[model samples]
Target: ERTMFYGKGDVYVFRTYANPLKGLKQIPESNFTEKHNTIFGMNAKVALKGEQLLTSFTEGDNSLVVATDSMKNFIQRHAASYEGATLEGFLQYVCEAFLAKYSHLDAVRLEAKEYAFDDIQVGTDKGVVTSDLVFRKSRNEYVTATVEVARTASGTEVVEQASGIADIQLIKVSGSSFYGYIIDEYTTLAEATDRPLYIFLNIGWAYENQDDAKGDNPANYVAAEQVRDIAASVFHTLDNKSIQHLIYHIGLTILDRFPQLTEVNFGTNNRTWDTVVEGAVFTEPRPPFGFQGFSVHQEDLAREKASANSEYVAL
Candidate 1:
């Protein structure tokens, strides 16, 4: 039997406290739209791979093996010296550099899940405004991007990717209902209307092409902060029915807002508080919690190359 493909590397999970904001793309500001100027307070998991390095498995070869310890140092050095605005761009930059430094390697995979931090409000001579320096991680959800880059004939390029917000928890006390399901001996659930709906979910995108993941510049790439804002705003706005319905609507809205994405998906945990009283309740299901996953792809998405200029009216 022939081996299809195999490689090994570490998933470097560590917080990089560096402020690499020097080369960030400039986001346009309009009357209604406000975008992020900060990608700080960061952490990442970088993975590397190469089929040629498989000799390490069979031959115990140390020649082609790029030490995992070396990767830790290399990743941090590049992170601090990153020149792009978004994580996807940063991954491409890092992978290109990695493949250059270690020509034996064939690919690199990296994911950065930024620590949630928002500008804190501080009084000044200009009255109340968000502080540029002082920040807080009061927000629960944050951005996450997993990007894969492979060495190309010419150089290195991004091959596959998933970028979007990660770890979001939202709840609405009313305007949510659960009902109309088959009941039997094994079934153990109570139908409720206008109770409370608590949900923890992440919504992310899989682009149609690698280039689609990159925008004209960094600002054009779908902003995780923007998508995060969309999902959270949607949770508060929608008339919740089933978990499927809520998730489906969230997926639809995200795709509409950013046409670059050909598909969007989500994973959610039903954390509706077990009712002890109106204001008092157990946090969640003790051991097992309900899980629902939703994914949607554009069927005829204006050729998937439709410019972001495509206009969409607010819901």
Candidate 2:
């Protein structure tokens, strides 16, 4: 008789370990595709279930159970092998590794969150020195990735994966406006032509092509990095009339650049405006220029360019 049972836990607990202090200089660089400082605050959680393990509940035989402690040890040992790998890459490796190692297990899921870091600077005799080995916790932002592995009854493997940016705090000094919305009794928001725009961006996306080759390719990592850069670039560059407008263009550009992605979802937490205090009031600054209305022709610039290029001659 066969049955299913589930267990879940986190690994890579906390604290930092380095190579140079242990006489293992350049270990990450030599072993991994990318070099990284040995200091990172990372958390990995795995959920797994086996087909035959459920018999333990019925027969009281725990001989087949893979202890949670063993899972944690395996994860850390594997993590050491891929020191500088991306979150998604590491998760995929873990998922596949566990599935292969545990014959009785039918499913494995791995999810991870890695904290961001910034170099620590100290004053020197000549100037400030940024230490490569030292870093300060950048608690403002974190990255997330998830990988799932399941086997079909017909002996086929299915993999589902995703990577994302979370808790991203960004602000554009200007170049944003909000207006022309439905007015209701609860509407206290005022229209502004120019104001400091701030938002916390959370983006989650998954690939359309599920082929293992595509999932394992380094190009996938590059594409995900580019997606984050493009989203940030668009947020800063676009003269956004609304947060919705900014997200629309960002999502569209990501899809255009990376057709491999099947879906792009963004959650925006707006904190652009200041809240009123007990005895304080909020006021809008005067617009830089007076509003002006004018008639305009769409083809004027194109027509002028064509005439200048001698496409049409005036009599």
Candidate 3:
């Protein structure tokens, strides 16, 4: 038999009073197109328009609420107003707008999505010079919204949750590798001396507020960049002769760069198999006892052998 359980974190309350409508009404859709796979497409436009519909809802303006056209136009205008703007910025604006427009309302959640565009080489008979845009047509993504409410007496509050992942896959292309380790019993594992190993990593950082993130010399991180850099150099360029060394190297590296980044985890295997006969010159005369009689260097040999024997216990 098997069982599963889930956990929840402490509820976060932004000390403000706000209320959104209890239900959702249909919003009008918009259609747009991309050229040579130039990203933004019709579905994204529709989602943007959907969000614009909320402005009408907030105003309780039935005149504008009855139709999607005006909302759709608003989305286009707003989107154009801030070229190269981020989703977070747009959401913040809308959230603040609700609070400012309705003194009774405090905060709101905003969400949006777009068709993820994939670029591929557009090759002709001559050659492949550039790429064309292709929409991941099968999927429709969502951004969510919630209007929150707060109670004045106890300063207690409720957050209506509207959340989604704005997916971005960044491939870190260079300046990353691993090396260093120790030998226990299992140390016989393999090429434990090699460096320049590779792995995938994920990272995120949060800002206290938008101003901290967007100021001329922001006090906070505006966006997170997933970087892939060699462990040793990332911390300090140290010679790692064993596996244990790599772990220490990585931990120190993370602490050095992003002191706020506390957690550390990894998986590793260290071993290599190369035939003894490799690079052999057949013309060389064999020793009388062959390689068997070659005396083993005993420096730390006793401890090394003991470690291996201890791990071979399962056998």
Candidate 4:
């Protein structure tokens, strides 16, 4: 059976041959040529079942479900059947089809990889034409999906997983602040009343407590609600603490709440901050003698144009 196939949105996966130097390589040269049809679009309903064979997200022994061999045959047989114009819409098709076909199954996820191509000159029998080459340095172009469904006994579960870049991200700029004792001499800092500050924290974590949070599992949802509520309070209260302190708080709180979470991984930026003046303010140029004792009506114009344009007239 075919391990993976295409769905929608914009997906690109390069299957590289085994190489010790690069761990695994991407085969751009082959992707653009052979997988053109799958790249453009495919029947996601067929794609989801194809994924089950290569993954263990489904029930341990696939007794009631159709064989992976039959799943692959369906895609090849009905490749040109459906209209999956968008990734989201294609996934909807998969969700609808899966439930319709197998009354026992609940949900399936769809993922697709579209290879990137570089424009190059291609020679023909008559002349040359500008075509795309399939090789490049590095690029992040893939689709991921999570689908949910409900069955009688199994309740609801995430039975399929598909992703292009399971671990790839980039970020800059974040909402942050500072407020603490800085009495030391080297703490060359000043007090602030609504001072402008910013920090960047690029990180992602496993949402362990997220169970049937998205579905009709009222009990599961209620429990997850508490987790979200406490998490929000933590962020709100730590407006004054440093980034290091906040990270520590998160770790400690998680340990206290869910001791089962042994080792967690995350990518984050350290303590970073930038100061900027908020709004606007002007300094009084005149020391003691202020602009006063002027005509009340005409005085407003005189004061505004006082420093810039001396010669002024009122209407």
Q: What TM-score would each prediction reach against the true structure?
A: 0.80, 0.68, 0.32, 0.30
Write model 4 residue lDDT over 1-315, tens digit each, in one string: 334432333222222321111111122111111112223332233334333344343445555546656655444433344443223333444455665676644445544333333335678776887544433432442323344343335444444332112222221233344557567978865654333322222221222343322222232211211222333344444443444544444333433343322322233333222334335432322233211111112223335446575332211
lDDT of 3: 0.31
**Root-mean-square deviation of every model:** 5.4, 11.1, 19.2, 21.8
lDDT of 2 at 113: 81
Task: List the candidate numbers ranked by lDDT, top first.
Answer: 1, 2, 4, 3
State which candidate has the highest lDDT.
Answer: 1
Q: Between candidates 1 and 4, name the one with more favorable lDDT.
A: 1
lDDT of 3 by residue, 1-315 (tens): 222111111211111111211111111110111112233222222211123345455676444232335434444444444322233444344444433433433333333443334435667887975544333342322222222333235542333322222222221222233334466787753443333323222222233232332222322222222112323233234444333443444433433333323333333333222234634312322332101111112222334337745221100
Better of 1 and 3 by lDDT: 1
Candidate 1 lDDT by residue in tens digits, 44-107: 6666677776777789887877677777778877766764455666667677788789887777
Considering only N, C-alpha and C atoms within 3 Å, which residue pairs clash in candidate 2? Answer: none
Give residue 74's lDDT in candidate 3 (0 to 100). 41
lDDT score for residue 64 of model 2: 79
User: Residue 5: error of model 4 in Å?
Assistant: 20
- The per-residue C-alpha lDDT of model 1 at residue 215 equals 46
Off by over 4 Å in 3: 1-77, 111-115, 132-203, 212-315
Candidate 2 C-alpha lDDT tens digits along 25-72: 121112223325366456888877766776777798878787888888
Q: Report the Cα lDDT for residue 37, model 2.
A: 38
Error of 3 at 260 (Å): 10
Per-model C-alpha lDDT, please? 0.67, 0.62, 0.31, 0.35
